[PDB]
């Protein structure tokens, strides 16, 4: 078969997609229904971003201040609200191209994937997942704020992130579409600093079960291990701790490979304590930790 | 900004996948225009794979055996024919939701977005390169055969990929529009190799720019060298063989770091050599060769 990460198809997120200007500063927004969705730092400029009183600036604009522009087709502004860090431009026109949605704040260790855009133009579609620290490692530049993240099931579309700013490390943070912020970030130039960032245990095994499924498996040893002793490693080598929950997210996986999720946890215990030794696991020469044990399930 | 593997929004080519059926056999097919484009073997049983007569087969066939659903709604098929190892079915309506489109042979080393598919549904998508032994490493289940490849430039949709088989070894084949397959593979159910699957030089190049413009620069050393004998040490390690083409085409990234394209050559061979010591390059643990450098200065 084979194994690629692998983007959800894109098209039911590129209708939505919009153009926001308010002053100079241009980003992209998401039209649903009649409601745009963009981060409020569209308000602000590049001085205001140090030390921004988001009421104040707001207060200053009236709904024609907001120039939302759809392909070559301009909406009319009825509405203006911020809810949290997003804000809601109440528009005349309800989407035609707008597909069943839902808005999900999902966990640590979730993927989705990210339809990035400029001036509300998508240019390209990536899978990733968000971090222990909340953090996501993106590709973002300056015209992208307010590109989304989603899943799709059926034709359900369930939008679970919204970009907002890159940290002085370089990694990205942003919010969900009620504007709550996913870490402890604030929509402001400040030195802010993610935890340290862990690795995503039950997707590492979930991944090793992929590559069992497609032939690569000189990493299957002999041992077995306890979930008690696998955790005390898992400190060591900073991934996140294992619970009972994970093992069971693995048994459809387990039934498929006739391997134990406890043997699977010996295989890794060794791969952390000696390292690949120069060889490829489904042509990675590290541990992936970007694919859920649904997302194997999805691809095999 | 960061730099992810990331392909182009798939809905304009959403809207032109279909399932072919003829016999048991389903595939999916490209409704452009009035023509569904699918894989010739559509007509074969997994009986026939060992050694079909395509013309044979097809004598058999007449416009009412192929069943061409889209979505819900059936298409009538008022012509067939052969070219090559597609099949090229007319059928009466044309497809509204038809891109600007062209068919594009590609050449090895580059780079295309896939849209993975199954009885006519889009599941999937991924950027990927095609080898220089003319396969790609792709992720295709049965069912995915005539899933499609492309690029994207303004709203021009450039078709240069169905997907055909799985080769023995895992790998993929398949076939531009016109249905001539790329390497030397035929549409049959036999042992076929592929050659010695060598690294892309160039792609590789361009990603450490990539990785310069991102701030890892820890393999940048201090030593330069020729053409000439940057391809001797290609040569031992399997790397395509540079040209003046080549190192022409890296000239704007070349303009923008500061680098020059032999000083870029030294660090690889030095890379080559050495190994990377366990140290990562924009989070990767090997040489990556799958972003040309035109894909570099899109997301750059």
Known sequence: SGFRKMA???????????????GTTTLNGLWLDDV???????????????????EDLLIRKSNHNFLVQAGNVQ????????????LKLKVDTANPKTPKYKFVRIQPGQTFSVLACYNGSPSGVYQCAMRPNFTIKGSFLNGSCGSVGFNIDYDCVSFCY???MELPTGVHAGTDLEG????????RQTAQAAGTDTTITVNVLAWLYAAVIN??????????????DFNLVAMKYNYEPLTQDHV???????????????????????????????RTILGSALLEDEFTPFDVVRQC
């Not at 745009?36 to 001085?47: A, F, M």
């Not at 069971?248 to 304590?273: F, N, R, Y």
């Open 215 to 228: 032939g690569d498996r000189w990493f299957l040893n002999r041992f077995t291990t306890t979930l008690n």
């Open 248 to 278: 069971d997210i693995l048994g459809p996986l387990s039934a498929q490979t006739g391997i134990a999720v406890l043997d699977m946890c010996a295989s890794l215990k060794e791969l952390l304590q000696n390292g690949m030794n120069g």
């Open 162 to 164: 919204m970009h907002h």
């Open 36 to 54: 745009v969705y963009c981060p409020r730092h569209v308000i602000c400029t590049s001085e205001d971003m140090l030390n921004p009183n988001y």
């Open 8 to 22: 959800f198809p894109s098209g039911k997120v590129e209708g939505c997609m919009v153009q926001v200007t308010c």
């Open 180 to 187: 709550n912020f996913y870490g402890p970030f604030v929509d």
């Open 75 to 86: 909406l009319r502004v009825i509405g203006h609200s911020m809810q949290n860090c997003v």
